[PDB]
Design an enzyme around this catalytic site. Structure first.
Site, PDB file in Angstrom:
ATOM      1  N   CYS A  30      -9.634   4.146  -6.641  1.00  0.00           N
ATOM      2  CA  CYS A  30      -8.855   4.548  -5.451  1.00  0.00           C
ATOM      3  C   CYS A  30      -9.378   3.706  -4.302  1.00  0.00           C
ATOM      4  O   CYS A  30     -10.591   3.490  -4.205  1.00  0.00           O
ATOM      5  CB  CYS A  30      -9.034   6.042  -5.177  1.00  0.00           C
ATOM      6  SG  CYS A  30      -8.277   6.642  -3.657  1.00  0.00           S
ATOM      7  N   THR A  31      -8.502   3.193  -3.453  1.00  0.00           N
ATOM      8  CA  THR A  31      -8.892   2.327  -2.346  1.00  0.00           C
ATOM      9  C   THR A  31      -9.965   2.938  -1.427  1.00  0.00           C
ATOM     10  O   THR A  31     -10.776   2.199  -0.833  1.00  0.00           O
ATOM     11  CB  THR A  31      -7.673   2.002  -1.445  1.00  0.00           C
ATOM     12  OG1 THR A  31      -7.028   3.227  -1.068  1.00  0.00           O
ATOM     13  CG2 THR A  31      -6.692   1.103  -2.140  1.00  0.00           C
ATOM     14  N   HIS A  32      -9.967   4.257  -1.308  1.00  0.00           N
ATOM     15  CA  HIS A  32     -10.829   4.939  -0.377  1.00  0.00           C
ATOM     16  C   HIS A  32     -12.260   5.060  -0.858  1.00  0.00           C
ATOM     17  O   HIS A  32     -13.190   5.203  -0.034  1.00  0.00           O
ATOM     18  CB  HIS A  32     -10.286   6.339  -0.054  1.00  0.00           C
ATOM     19  CG  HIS A  32      -8.993   6.339   0.718  1.00  0.00           C
ATOM     20  ND1 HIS A  32      -7.933   5.506   0.414  1.00  0.00           N
ATOM     21  CD2 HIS A  32      -8.601   7.074   1.782  1.00  0.00           C
ATOM     22  CE1 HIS A  32      -6.936   5.753   1.256  1.00  0.00           C
ATOM     23  NE2 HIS A  32      -7.329   6.679   2.114  1.00  0.00           N
ATOM     24  N   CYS A  47      -2.830  -0.348  -3.843  1.00  0.00           N
ATOM     25  CA  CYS A  47      -2.955   1.066  -4.180  1.00  0.00           C
ATOM     26  C   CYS A  47      -3.023   1.266  -5.667  1.00  0.00           C
ATOM     27  O   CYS A  47      -2.175   0.799  -6.425  1.00  0.00           O
ATOM     28  CB  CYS A  47      -1.777   1.816  -3.546  1.00  0.00           C
ATOM     29  SG  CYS A  47      -1.639   3.557  -4.005  1.00  0.00           S
ATOM     30  N   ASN A  48      -4.050   1.989  -6.108  1.00  0.00           N
ATOM     31  CA  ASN A  48      -4.190   2.330  -7.531  1.00  0.00           C
ATOM     32  C   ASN A  48      -3.094   3.256  -8.032  1.00  0.00           C
ATOM     33  O   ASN A  48      -2.715   3.200  -9.201  1.00  0.00           O
ATOM     34  CB  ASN A  48      -5.539   2.980  -7.793  1.00  0.00           C
ATOM     35  CG  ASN A  48      -6.715   1.976  -7.682  1.00  0.00           C
ATOM     36  OD1 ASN A  48      -7.124   1.354  -8.693  1.00  0.00           O
ATOM     37  ND2 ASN A  48      -7.207   1.765  -6.462  1.00  0.00           N
ATOM     38  N   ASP A 103       0.836  -1.187   0.000  1.00  0.00           N
ATOM     39  CA  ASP A 103       0.000   0.000   0.000  1.00  0.00           C
ATOM     40  C   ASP A 103       0.865   1.228   0.000  1.00  0.00           C
ATOM     41  O   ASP A 103       2.019   1.189   0.449  1.00  0.00           O
ATOM     42  CB  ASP A 103      -0.894  -0.014   1.244  1.00  0.00           C
ATOM     43  CG  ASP A 103      -2.125   0.918   1.152  1.00  0.00           C
ATOM     44  OD1 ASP A 103      -2.425   1.474   0.069  1.00  0.00           O
ATOM     45  OD2 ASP A 103      -2.793   1.086   2.204  1.00  0.00           O
ATOM     46  N   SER A 104       0.278   2.345  -0.442  1.00  0.00           N
ATOM     47  CA  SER A 104       0.761   3.663  -0.087  1.00  0.00           C
ATOM     48  C   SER A 104       0.447   3.887   1.396  1.00  0.00           C
ATOM     49  O   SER A 104       1.366   4.097   2.233  1.00  0.00           O
ATOM     50  CB  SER A 104       0.139   4.706  -1.026  1.00  0.00           C
ATOM     51  OG  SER A 104      -1.270   4.501  -1.122  1.00  0.00           O
ATOM     52  N   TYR A 157       0.311   9.506  -1.606  1.00  0.00           N
ATOM     53  CA  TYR A 157       1.011   9.390  -2.886  1.00  0.00           C
ATOM     54  C   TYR A 157       0.237  10.048  -4.029  1.00  0.00           C
ATOM     55  O   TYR A 157       0.813  10.411  -5.056  1.00  0.00           O
ATOM     56  CB  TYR A 157       1.296   7.922  -3.237  1.00  0.00           C
ATOM     57  CG  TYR A 157       2.402   7.200  -2.471  1.00  0.00           C
ATOM     58  CD1 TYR A 157       2.860   7.603  -1.212  1.00  0.00           C
ATOM     59  CD2 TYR A 157       2.921   6.028  -2.988  1.00  0.00           C
ATOM     60  CE1 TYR A 157       3.841   6.898  -0.537  1.00  0.00           C
ATOM     61  CE2 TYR A 157       3.880   5.303  -2.335  1.00  0.00           C
ATOM     62  CZ  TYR A 157       4.359   5.730  -1.099  1.00  0.00           C
ATOM     63  OH  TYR A 157       5.303   4.956  -0.486  1.00  0.00           O
ATOM     64  N   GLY A 158      -1.089  10.151  -3.889  1.00  0.00           N
ATOM     65  CA  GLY A 158      -1.951  10.616  -4.987  1.00  0.00           C
ATOM     66  C   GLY A 158      -1.716  12.008  -5.521  1.00  0.00           C
ATOM     67  O   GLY A 158      -2.125  12.300  -6.625  1.00  0.00           O
TER      68      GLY A 158
HETATM   69  N1  LIG Z   1      -3.468   6.020  -0.260  1.00  0.00           N
HETATM   70  C1  LIG Z   1      -3.834   6.985  -1.356  1.00  0.00           C
HETATM   71  C2  LIG Z   1      -3.968   6.380  -2.749  1.00  0.00           C
HETATM   72  C3  LIG Z   1      -4.862   5.137  -2.820  1.00  0.00           C
HETATM   73  C4  LIG Z   1      -5.142   4.679  -4.234  1.00  0.00           C
HETATM   74  O1  LIG Z   1      -4.820   5.402  -5.193  1.00  0.00           O
HETATM   75  O2  LIG Z   1      -5.758   3.597  -4.367  1.00  0.00           O
HETATM   76  C5  LIG Z   1      -2.795   8.061  -1.463  1.00  0.00           C
HETATM   77  O3  LIG Z   1      -1.720   7.885  -0.920  1.00  0.00           O
HETATM   78  O4  LIG Z   1      -3.040   9.095  -2.120  1.00  0.00           O
END
Ligand SMILES: N[C@H](CCC(=O)O)C(=O)O
Ligand SMILES: N[C@H](CCC(=O)O)C(=O)O
Ligand SMILES: N[C@H](CCC(=O)O)C(=O)O
Ligand SMILES: N[C@H](CCC(=O)O)C(=O)O
Ligand SMILES: N[C@H](CCC(=O)O)C(=O)O
Ligand SMILES: N[C@H](CCC(=O)O)C(=O)O
Lengths: 264, 264, 263, 264, 264, 263
Positions: free
Chosen positions: E182-184, E73-74, E10-11, E42-43
């Site tokens: 996105c996971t969220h 993570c996408n 994951d991020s 990370y996004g």
């Molecule tokens: N955890 C989110 C990204 C999750 C995703 O893109 O699936 C971030 O770091 O921005």
């Protein structure tokens, strides 16, 4: 396909003029500029290495699903056009050497100045001779010009003396026009014109027009109503980049992002 | 460990002088020179990118099991010494900035010229001030010098005018010595001496002597009876490389091989 | 046109002999040498592979607008001369086999040693018998010679023993001369002479002289009075300069790594 | 997955021994051999070229859907192992250097012979020292051996003399074992033993054992009743290729097919 | 091999859903979760930085001897998938983009929402077009969603208004499905469905199914009687981390341990 | 020494406000801005992580031989001021919390909004109560504000609703002023004012004025009459220039990607 961006493919820094040109004839198009700032200059590198680098940038742009590529850099056009075309497959590629040739192919005697890689590749003489083998082509590398210009020496006595060193070769050749066969050289055109009083050919706008004609004739014009997106993707951002790049672009590089070719 | 090679770590081209120096004080030692010719110059690149590149070269040299590293390049020394040291672990690393500092740290007023990256990093002033914070340090980048010299402009009116542009900064500063803080600059020392009549400091030989003292005191000297092996590993071989490199080396680069940092 | 370079077309390494010869007899000519160092040797490869490789180099050289081409390699000359000529179009091509054949056309019994590919192609016998069918031609491949020489075995007991293995064939053939039909073999001519007491024909200089004649006849001589020598190669391994400079007999002025991927 | 073929990845010709070994150790597995016969030898080429070539082969093999790869060639293993593994993502890759190192990591003094490329890469010494940094490793290239053997000189006075030239380096080194670090060298092991009579280590058979272990413990063994299929993909079929290849394979290649790697 | 853990890469924070899914689908497997909580999000970061970070995590996970990885993570999947797979050589790597693409390749018009980085990378459109180049893909970033959800705004008027801002792009596109890239985003799917009521595709659950299939068909399932072990490795434990993480995981993290990636 | 630059020490993006202020009040000073754009936000990270990150930036700035440092970020100021001062040694450090506290020390009831980390640290209340224990200080974190603002939600119904969620807390507290204890919050001061009709204290200018005073008192003012502005950052994503230049109110002159890996 219509609403995909145009890819502007550079070695670095001088190709920003093509972005400027495009913004003047195709104001509704999205543009992705790529500059391999981490590994410039290309003008003093080997053919094998220039091809290696260009294959990576080509793959990066094709992954962004550009609708067309323009190779802004004479050095990449000279040495890696076919490498880029092969990767682009059905995506059209326009190049600045084709543009330059199109502006001189009715003359009898033509001069060319360019990077050492470009001149040593023989690409301009070869391509001119593909149109007409009896055109007399005189070529001379101007190795110092790229760094000189990037360091801000763009007029004055130093620029004039370096230009005299490189352009004296042409004084007895009776050329009808001089191809400015490097993106950087039009910046110093006024100094060049003082030393060698002949028609100076800058192929950047012609290359942009070639891309316009292709998009128009093939009905591939952007019909979105949103602000055009201009993205500047680069492999390094050194301290002088903003200022030297925007000298060529003539406007702000507002959306700028550091990227890597490690996976390409 | 005794019979392992010395690694000479360069950005490219100017570090060949360290090879020359080593061959004059340690004639029985094997030497591996590394030059990242594909991505030079480093002097105009960002700190992040210089560190990225230096980590790759460091790993390549450590995989060759060198017994010691000398960083010949002032730009890598300024920005990536710690990155290199961390990778080298128990292998000692000598650097040219440490050498330069050692030659000026009893003066009151010192000038430094170097690449834009080196001067903007502040490394020379910082390291001089680590010895004595009250030494007055005046620094000025000389951006055009590297390309100028690589293009063969090594004396004459152009070199003198470019040097006047960069060295005029020092005329009112009452410096006691000027550090030639780039590998390329000693080539033009005679032109520099015409403009700025002060002691010129070239740290390359001092760096080589530092490496000699370390090997001697630690009993790590080559005791083989075979011809020493000098290997020049580079990431590009453009047409001008042989001639410009051997201008610095002052002898033939007889065993030359194209390598890649792709896996590093 | 007369200020364009000469192209020396090699497989790799041994064709530097032709550059040496041209530096001597044509001291004011610019020269581009091409060596496909990435893919050598050619001498043990198939006919179709050699033809494929040679076509790429030919196209590279024509893009440079050389004024003439000399095929320095006997293997390319044996197998791909027609392909090179088809690509070169109006650019004249001299080759080393034509040179070698020209030196024996007054004899009646001749031997030829060459790479396995050159001998397999039968090019030397065919080109000789074409001029005079009555000349007896005896051919024998010498497969190990190229590597042996590039690894620096150029005199002494090993060279003599390998040479005896390949040359003993000629002892009972009553040949009046032996054509050294590979660029590498003149390096070991002293060992060859030892085993076979016959005139040894090295076509290198004659090919270079034929090129001079061609430039003179076609009004293509460079009249200028310092030439430039460019060495374009598809690989540069550590041993390349040493071995190459052994054939060239001077240091390579300007060397560049190039690719045939687009050719 | 368990019914996919094993890939044997070679530079050319010598890797056929590993195919022979796998026919005996894994008689129910399908095997694909790849040899780049158009471009051999690799042993005398640069690191950059070896890596370029190996990347193309690796991509071809992955496109055949192999379940595991053994890198039969010491030269590719030395210089391009990471390149190959990065392309063969999830596919496990066994290499002959790892195999060789596993046979000597109990010793104090080890000799290595290999191609110039393998020795110059330092890979054997480096990899040995990963396991035990205190092992003394002495390495010497045997450049003529590959061609000599391919030309059918595999015993007798010529072979003994060439071997004496190369192996004289070891006579004063008191080595406990000699790694035969090239696929070709076991062919002349009787001659080597006449000159340097120490324990000779053959990485190829050990590599084959490691592949069996990987498949057996990881449950990737083929248990189908369809007869095993053997495919030999090559980039050329040169003059005496079958006769030379059959010296190593010790049986006929029933499917021998020319492929081009130019698209990779 | 079959008793080694599965890695969930994951991020940070959102990937805990995949851990939840694997606890249900693969209840006898050990799992290691990694979240770079010190450096999220990370996004909103560059491609070069995302790749730098992902390379460090991947190296940490490989050092824990995992038998398979799912990139939850996408954003990492979009930009750094190849980097991760190259580091995780033989270890198979499942990614959520591949999962998402597998659910829509029968359609004609598809919408995608994701982080700015994911959308700017063009990865969803590119990957969709690998399967079917004729699918119309419309993509829009939803930059505020990640922080909004992490701050506990998961339903209600604020969420509906922000969603209206981002989803208004699709109202005239006639999409047949919307990829929640996105996971969220599945956390607020009820609010999304109130605004844009089309089929919603959740890559995370499909990724979990693909991992089961890979392990089941390839015989890599854990059948030990020792209780499953769950480890959560993070680079920070911020303020409300457990409460936010437990929103996604839906159970407590029994072993939560801070690690540093600085050595990678 | 007086020709050395000022260092503006930020977590990222919002500290550009301090650069803007210094460009205005100190137009002939050179400035180095540092933003750890790779690792933002800091405001939701742990105390120990913020301290680790801040120590690296401090060391970077001291290597540049800045003559003074202004900590533009409330989060670093709350949590890592002592670490930064220990690293800076004789280089003076001004911080925004000291500035904010200086503006309320004549009041008796004060509110403070800041990042979750800043509020958790209790730095504002502690530093205020230290000066006068009788001042009532009410604190509330505003977690979503930083991202909301960086994503360009800076007015309108969404901003008003999020603001109501965080600020309604203050309605019954009888505060005489609210400290905008995060660089980002002044961007939305119009929406904050709407909800809470109290004096809004923005410590940015006061911090910049304190730095001026410090340079004047220590005789460190640059006397020259065109300054250079360098923006050193650990990442450059596509949106960075737009968002940053929103705070800076001019274009960034010179931008460079740097690394803290060695710090
Ligand atoms: N955890 C989110 C990204 C999750 C995703 O893109 O699936 C971030 O770091 O921005
Ligand atoms: N950007 C220049 C080349 C530009 C051109 O040739 O047009 C360089 O890399 O050398
Ligand atoms: N080789 C020069 C730097 C040499 C030095 O700084 O000493 C360059 O890459 O710019
Ligand atoms: N260069 C040699 C052939 C030379 C020759 O046949 O003249 C080879 O590639 O095998
Ligand atoms: N096939 C040999 C190398 C074999 C090996 O190194 O094991 C070559 O190409 O030189
Ligand atoms: N830049 C903001 C903090 C700014 C401030 O607290 O003043 C962050 O990293 O969260």
């Amino acid at each position: 396909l219509d609403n995909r961006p145009i890819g502007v493919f550079d070695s670095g820094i001088g190709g920003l003029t093509i972005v400027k040109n495009l913004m003047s004839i195709l104001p509704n198009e999205d543009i992705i500029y790529f500059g391999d700032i981490a590994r410039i200059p290309y003008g003093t590198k080997s053919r094998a290495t220039i091809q290696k680098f260009a294959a990576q940038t080509a793959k990066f742009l094709i992954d962004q699903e550009v609708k067309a590529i323009i190779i802004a850099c004479n050095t990449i056009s000279a040495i890696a056009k076919d490498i880029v075309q092969e990767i682009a497959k059905a995506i059209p590629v326009i190049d600045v050497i084709t543009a330059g040739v199109s502006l001189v192919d009715n003359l009898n005697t033509v001069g060319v100045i360019a990077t050492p890689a470009t001149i040593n590749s023989n690409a301009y003489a070869l391509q001119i001779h593909k149109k007409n083998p009896n055109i007399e082509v005189y070529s001379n590398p101007c190795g110092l010009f790229v760094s000189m210009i990037e360091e801000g020496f763009v007029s004055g006595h130093i620029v004039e003396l370096v230009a005299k060193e490189y352009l004296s070769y042409f004084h007895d050749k009776n050329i009808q026009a001089l191809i400015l066969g490097c993106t950087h050289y039009p910046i110093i055109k006024e100094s060049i014109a003082k030393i060698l009083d002949v028609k100076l050919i800058d192929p950047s706008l012609q290359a942009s027009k070639m891309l316009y004609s292709l998009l128009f004739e093939n009905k591939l014009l952007n019909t979105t109503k949103s602000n055009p997106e201009y993205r500047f993707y680069v492999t390094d951002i050194p301290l002088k980049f903003r200022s030297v790049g925007e000298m060529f672009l003539q406007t702000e590089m507002q959306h700028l992002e550091i990227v890597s070719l490690d996976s390409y």
